[PDB]
Amino acid sequence: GCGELVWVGEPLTLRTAETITGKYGVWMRDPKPTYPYTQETTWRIDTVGTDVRQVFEYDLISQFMQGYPSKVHILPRPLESTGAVVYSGSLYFQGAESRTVIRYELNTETVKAEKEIPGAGYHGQFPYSWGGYTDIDLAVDEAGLWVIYSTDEAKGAIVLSKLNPENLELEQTWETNIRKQSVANAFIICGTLYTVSSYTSADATVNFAYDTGTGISKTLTIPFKNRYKYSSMIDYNPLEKKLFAWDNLNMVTYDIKLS
Ligand SMILES: [Ca+2]
Ligand code: NA
């Protein structure tokens, strides 16, 4: 059961990074956890630097909030920005300085697929408003795996494609009429693209929505606060039905309300 986003709030900090190297990054959980993982398994990637490859893995939420990682994966390839997601036992991330999406099976630590997103800009071409090499933004919702980006053909407007979680083949593609660079970030809920924009570093709003079903968009005003004033990523988890975000060394979640 899905619905339309009508509310965002109740930001909760779950974990503060140990060092300044965790100023920004991406943390997430698997909406469709596979053995030996569960709905509590938590992955954390500090992305401060040029050589990002370590992936902290926590078995329990108590472990994630208090103790140490159960395991540390070393990615064969370097990771770009904060747009990665975990889905069905695999990490989906962007190859550094490339337009290549990579499926990395966590349990076997094996690369299952590599796929350039056709015509997509990368490494500074189409980042979100605050920049940060955020050209390519992966997403998981109730329908599965998506990728958010832009192309020259789309004239810098946000483009979203439904991805095959197995071989990363583009199944469907939608062109919007909103510039990706005019927006702070984005996520997908029940097949609906939502964008986030900032009046300030602490003040944010969900300002736009595009339904891939109907094909029509809306302007919106759904305010929420960036408590620590430097958000580097915000994704949606279709299982917990919350927003996961990274804000100035803090790994936070937002609760939401769907109509
Ligand atoms: Ca996002
Ligand atoms: Na993402």
From Swiss-Prot:
Binding of Ca(2+), residues: D137, N185, A186, I234, D235
Result of altering P238T: In GLC1A; uncertain significance
Domain of life: Eukaryota
Record annotation: effect of changing G191S: In GLC1A; uncertain significance
Protein name: Myocilin, C-terminal fragment
Residue ranges constituting the Olfactomedin-like domain according to the UniProt record: 1-259
Effect of substituting T205P: In GLC1A; uncertain significance
Location of this chain's protein in the cell: Secreted
Record annotation: effect of changing R179H: In GLC1A; uncertain significance
Disulfide bonds: C2-C190
Reported effect, V86M: Slightly decreased protein stability
Result of changing I222M: In GLC1A; uncertain significance
Result, substituting R99K: In GLC1A; uncertain significance
Effect of D137N: In GLC1A; uncertain significance
Part of the full-length chain shown: 244 to 502 of 504
Result of altering Q94E: In GLC1A; uncertain significance
Effect the entry attributes to changing D137G: In GLC1A; uncertain significance
Gene: MYOC
